[PDB]
Amino acid sequence: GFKQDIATLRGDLRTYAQDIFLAFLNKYPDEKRNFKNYVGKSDQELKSMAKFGDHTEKVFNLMMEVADRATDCVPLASDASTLVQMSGLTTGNFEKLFVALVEYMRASGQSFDSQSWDRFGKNLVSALSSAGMK
Numbered sequence: 001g002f003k004q005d006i007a008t009l010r011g012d013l014r015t016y017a018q019d020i021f022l023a024f025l026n027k028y029p030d031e032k033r034n035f036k037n038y039v040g041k042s043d044q045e046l047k048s049m050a051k052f053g054d055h056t057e058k059v060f061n062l063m064m065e066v067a068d069r070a071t072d073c074v075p076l077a078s079d080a081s082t083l084v085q086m087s088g089l090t091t092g093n094f095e096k097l098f099v100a101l102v103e104y105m106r107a108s109g110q111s112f113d114s115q116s117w118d119r120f121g122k123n124l125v126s127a128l129s130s131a132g133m134k
């Protein structure tokens with residue numbers, strides 16, 4: 001289930017981080033509105049851009065840290081606070097990333113606990129809102 005998933009994602013974090021963030025960008029083409037430098041690039045061309053690999057990996061690492069400290073897929077309010085205080089982002093964009101993550105898990109042949117990820121995303125979004133993210 002959820003804890004084992006974090007370990008599975010950690011064991012190939014750079015490739016899962018890139019492949020899930022590409023699933024997100026291709027499901028929600030308008031989210032490139034927020035990535036001037038990714039517009040007009042295929043998956044292969046993004047995978048050659050240093051900050052593509054290094055940003056996606058840092059984001060998923062942080063998500064894994066928040067997931068690892070969560071109880072029953074509920075993140076720490078402290079963690080939400082820290083995230084909101086870390087330039088312009090929304091709970092809607094986070095929600096979409098999680099929808100992409102869960103669909104990516106469901107289509108894998110691996111026993112990902114996709115329902116726990118869906119609950120975790122819904123609880124992180126609510127935590128961010130409660131901590132003052134628009």
Ligand code: FDE
Nearest residue numbers: 034035036055058059062063083086087088089093094097
């Ligand atoms: C959808 C989504 C999701 C997400 C998630 C996340 C998590 C968990 C964490 C995070 C963090 C962050 N962000 Fe994050 N995210 C996103 C998005 C984003 C954007 C769009 C930005 C900026 C804008 C531009 O310009 O690109 C960011 C951004 C961000 C940041 C800053 C940048 C760098 O420096 O790297 C940080 C730190 N993000 N993040």
Ligand SMILES: Oc1c(Cl)cc(Cl)cc1Cl
Nearest residue numbers: 021051052053055056059
């Ligand atoms: O370059 C970025 C990527 Cl690939 C993902 C996110 Cl969430 C943020 C940035 Cl700045």
